[PDB]
RNA sequence: AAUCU
């Protein structure tokens, strides 16, 4: 939902911000073994899965991607982009969440703000 | 002691045992009797697996030597005589096919009739404490256990025995032969063994 | 990967394992099983000698 | 400011001094695996090129 | 109200 445009004097400050917020439960070391069990279930070795969120994600992504033939490598790359976190230093005004940083080229300028509100659902930590 | 275990066993056993000892990160000279125990484990597993082939059902039909035909199916699949990666790969493939449970530590065999793993052990000390050691290590288990003793008496879970008694007798004959050929050399005393020696070895450049 | 064996060893080993597990409950029949086990045997006769 | 002839004045022997001061009170294998680069860049050579 | 490359 777009809104009006406001011209004004804007100050941007440089900060570390999230591109991908990742899954909050997996810690970025469990996520890789999850990716391994989903895509390469026989080549994982000794690692059992412990947490309940791991099993939930595993069964979900395992019944979704049942008999696909896209490629295991690309499926793994995209699951990484889904699950693991990724940061970057950028100049920022306004919102710092990831849904507001993918559109920072459109919401914020040198002289102008563009009101905008993404469409999906929002996490309550941000709120 | 290394000389004896090189003399007695055929070179496949000692080859794979030295491979496994190198993979462990140990020194064959600082730790020796472990090498002989590993050789014995390898040999009894090979004998437990060899002289066994499968029928349309399970419950192995035994042969002197396998007949040449499509019926190549062994009842037993060997796990421990392998590298770490290939062994865990066999395990995970099995667990993902039959929906079985995944162990935490590597078993030694897999049996198709009753569809479960087996963890053979061989001990100088008699059974019923090593059994519970094996059990509380193998927690939440379906894998059968079948432990031997140098004296001539064995043990199992549920009083279950996964093969003939004649093959057990063969294992026991080989084992007693080993023990009281050891007694001739006088190295039986050194079998009360445990992992020792400081493996935190100094770095040297 | 990680290992000390030659590549052919791991390759033929995994071939045998997948053959067994896929014949037991699945797709592989007896003819394929015997034929690929024969090929594995010849690979061994080529590597070890 | 910029520095002139920065890469010609800087000597590896000063780097060896620095290394031996930074590895002060460390294991000798570490002191001896970090001391080899400034050595080998103090006895270095240079290919001249195509001609 | 934040500490992850």
């Amino acid at each position: 939902t777009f809104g009006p445009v406001h011209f004004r004097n804007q100050v941007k400050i440089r900060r570390r911000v999230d591109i991908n917020p990742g899954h909050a439960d997996l810690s970025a070391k469990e996520a890789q073994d999850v990716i391994m069990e989903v895509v390469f279930p026989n080549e994982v070795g000794a690692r059992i899965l412990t947490s309940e969120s791991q099993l939930t994600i595993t069964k979900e992504k395992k019944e979704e991607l049942q008999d696909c033939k896209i490629s295991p490598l690309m499926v793994a790359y995209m699951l990484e982009r889904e699950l693991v976190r990724k940061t970057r230093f950028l100049p920022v005004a306004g919102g710092t969440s990831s849904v507001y940083i993918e559109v920072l080229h459109l919401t914020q300028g040198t002289c102008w703000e563009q009101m905008y509100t993404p469409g999906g659902e929002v996490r309550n930590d941000d709120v | 002691m290394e000389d004896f275990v090189r003399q007695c066993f055929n070179p496949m056993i000692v080859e794979l045992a030295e491979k496994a000892m190198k993979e462990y990160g140990e020194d064959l000279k600082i730790e020796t009797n472990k090498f002989a125990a590993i050789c014995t484990h390898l040999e009894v597993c090979f004998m437990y697996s060899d002289f066994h082939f499968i029928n349309e059902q399970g419950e192995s039909i035994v042969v002197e030597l396998d007949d040449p035909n499509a019926l190549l199916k062994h009842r037993f699949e060997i796990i421990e005589g392998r590298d770490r990666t290939m062994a865990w790969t066999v395990v995970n493939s099995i667990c993902n096919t039959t929906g079985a449970e995944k162990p935490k530590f590597l078993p030694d065999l897999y049996d198709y009739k009753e569809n479960r793993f087996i963890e053979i052990g061989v001990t100088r000390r008699e059974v019923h404490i090593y059994y519970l050691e094996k059990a509380n290590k193998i927690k939440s288990e379906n894998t059968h256990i079948h432990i031997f003793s140098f004296t001539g008496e064995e043990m199992a879970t549920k009083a279950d025995y996964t093969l003939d008694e004649e093959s057990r007798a063969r294992i026991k004959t080989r084992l007693f032969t080993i023990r009281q050929e050891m007694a001739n050399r006088g190295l039986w005393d050194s079998f009360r063994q445990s992992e020792r020696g400081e493996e935190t070895i100094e770095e040297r450049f | 990967p990680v290992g000390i064996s030659s590549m052919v060893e791991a390759m033929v080993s995994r071939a045998r394992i997948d053959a067994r597990i896929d014949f037991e409950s699945g797709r592989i029949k007896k003819e394929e099983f015997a034929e690929i086990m024969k090929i594995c045997s010849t690979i061994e006769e080529l590597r070890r000698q | 400011g910029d520095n002139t002839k920065w890469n010609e004045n800087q000597n590896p022997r000063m780097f060896l001094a620095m290394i031996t001061y930074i590895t002060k009170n460390q294991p000798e294998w570490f002191r001896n695996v970090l001391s080899i680069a400034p050595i080998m860049f103090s006895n270095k050579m240079a290919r001249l090129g195509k001609g």
Side-chain angles (χ1 to χ4, degrees):
Chain A
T1 302
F2 288 105
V5 171
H6 299 107
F7 285 89
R8 56 157 174 271
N9 220 327
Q10 179 175 353
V11 194
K12 296 189 154 172
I13 302 111
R14 287 166 220 266
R15 281 174 224 294
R16 198 164 263 287
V17 299
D18 292 15
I19 310 315
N20 310 339
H23 215 92
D25 297 331
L26 268 55
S27 80
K29 302 287 176 230
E30 315 188 338
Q32 188 153 88
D33 301 356
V34 168
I35 288 154
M36 215 68 195
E37 198 156 320
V38 170
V39 194
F40 300 108
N42 300 339
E43 286 88 359
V44 56
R47 185 88 152 169
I48 52 156
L49 318 177
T50 79
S51 172
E52 311 192 358
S53 44
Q54 288 211 54
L55 277 302
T56 303
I57 289 151
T58 319
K59 67 168 281 304
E60 201 85 11
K61 304 295 202 173
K62 178 171 272 290
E63 73 201 349
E64 287 181 358
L65 318 172
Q66 182 58 293
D67 297 326
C68 197
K69 58 206 310 203
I70 279 161
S71 52
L73 201 52
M74 206 73 209
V75 174
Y77 174 82
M78 295 317 302
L79 274 176
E80 286 176 357
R81 284 288 162 296
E82 282 184 41
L83 304 167
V84 294
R85 189 142 168 280
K86 190 186 171 68
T87 46
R88 221 178 271 163
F89 260 82
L90 306 169
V92 174
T96 295
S97 190
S98 54
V99 301
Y100 267 107
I101 287 282
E102 58 164 21
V103 289
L104 170 63
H105 64 279
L106 167 74
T107 53
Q108 304 297 147
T110 81
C111 60
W112 59 267
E113 200 213 1
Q114 170 77 67
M115 202 174 166
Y116 177 71
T117 310
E121 67 279 18
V122 73
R123 310 179 168 191
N124 281 276
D125 296 331
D126 301 355
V127 187
Chain B
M1 182 58 184
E2 306 186 358
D3 56 348
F4 157 72
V5 70
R6 287 220 177 72
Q7 290 294 322
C8 179
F9 294 108
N10 59 3
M12 311 309 163
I13 299 282
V14 75
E15 183 65 25
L16 306 173
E18 187 175 2
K19 297 267 189 70
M21 191 63 73
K22 199 194 189 64
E23 299 217 291
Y24 288 0
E26 305 297 344
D27 282 2
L28 177 63
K29 329 305 294 190
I30 311 309
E31 183 64 25
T32 294
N33 303 52
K34 188 77 89 177
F35 196 64
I38 289 282
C39 284
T40 68
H41 201 143
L42 265 292
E43 180 55 284
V44 300
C45 281
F46 278 32
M47 291 200 96
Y48 185 83
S49 291
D50 204 328
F51 316 100
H52 291 280
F53 265 72
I54 210 175
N55 52 356
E56 306 98 299
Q57 318 314 323
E59 187 60 28
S60 292
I61 58 176
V62 172
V63 302
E64 282 105 328
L65 184 134
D66 180 30
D67 68 328
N69 55 352
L71 287 78
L72 171 57
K73 271 73 74 161
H74 291 86
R75 173 138 161 284
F76 289 104
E77 193 73 344
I78 297 147
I79 306 308
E80 59 86 20
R82 275 171 149 99
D83 199 352
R84 170 154 69 199
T85 48
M86 184 51 48
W88 289 109
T89 288
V90 173
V91 166
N92 277 294
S93 291
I94 296 282
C95 299
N96 273 285
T97 293
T98 75
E101 184 64 26
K102 202 191 156 161
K104 326 300 179 292
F105 307 95
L106 296 179
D108 303 346
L109 305 97
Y110 183 76
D111 181 16
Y112 289 126
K113 180 216 80 181
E114 58 187 358
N115 302 120
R116 44 171 199 197
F117 299 103
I118 299 163
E119 184 151 14
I120 292 165
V122 174
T123 313
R124 175 171 171 194
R125 301 183 284 91
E126 84 304 340
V127 181
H128 62 79
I129 70 190
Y130 208 98
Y131 194 99
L132 293 174
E133 288 169 15
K134 198 76 78 169
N136 63 7
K137 288 288 281 271
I138 304 299
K139 317 189 199 188
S140 198
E141 66 82 19
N142 173 219
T143 181
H144 192 236
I145 294 163
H146 195 307
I147 192 184
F148 281 79
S149 297
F150 284 88
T151 66
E153 56 86 18
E154 56 269 32
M155 184 48 186
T157 309
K158 301 182 286 294
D160 187 9
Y161 304 91
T162 66
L163 77 176
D164 294 278
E165 280 71 352
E166 292 69 19
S167 297
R168 286 197 251 160
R170 207 188 309 286
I171 289 157
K172 285 192 285 290
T173 59
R174 184 74 215 188
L175 195 62
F176 176 76
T177 294
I178 287 154
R179 97 182 286 286
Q180 68 91 25
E181 204 281 338
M182 211 79 63
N184 289 320
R185 315 304 185 74
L187 294 96
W188 173 264
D189 62 347
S190 305
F191 282 16
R192 296 212 170 287
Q193 54 83 15
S194 177
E195 183 63 27
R196 307 190 210 175
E198 189 65 13
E199 292 85 6
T200 72
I201 69 188
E202 184 63 24
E203 185 67 28
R204 185 60 52 195
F205 198 81
Chain C
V2 287
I4 302 148
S5 63
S6 62
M7 294 137 75
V8 70
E9 159 162 20
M11 280 145 75
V12 70
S13 297
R14 209 206 158 106
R16 285 167 179 162
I17 297 304
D18 302 318
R20 200 75 163 69
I21 277 161
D22 287 326
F23 171 86
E24 269 291 345
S25 297
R27 289 81 58 202
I28 304 300
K29 305 309 305 183
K30 304 181 298 312
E31 298 316 302
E32 299 184 32
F33 200 73
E35 209 179 353
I36 69 191
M37 270 274 183
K38 204 193 293 184
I39 299 161
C40 286
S41 313
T42 58
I43 282 155
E44 292 288 288
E45 267 97 15
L46 288 172
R47 85 180 270 262
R48 299 292 294 161
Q49 301 86 358
Chain D
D2 187 77
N3 282 307
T4 191
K5 310 290 161 186
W6 164 267
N7 312 91
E8 295 182 354
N9 312 141
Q10 291 291 72
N11 189 290
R13 299 175 198 236
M14 297 289 87
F15 292 149
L16 180 57
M18 295 163 81
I19 291 281
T20 56
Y21 196 90
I22 293 164
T23 47
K24 216 169 63 152
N25 305 319
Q26 294 294 336
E28 202 77 349
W29 64 272
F30 191 61
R31 205 162 199 197
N32 283 345
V33 71
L34 305 168
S35 286
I36 298 283
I39 290 168
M40 290 169 76
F41 273 136
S42 198
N43 296 275
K44 72 182 168 292
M45 325 300 287
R47 287 184 87 244
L48 297 166
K50 305 179 190 152

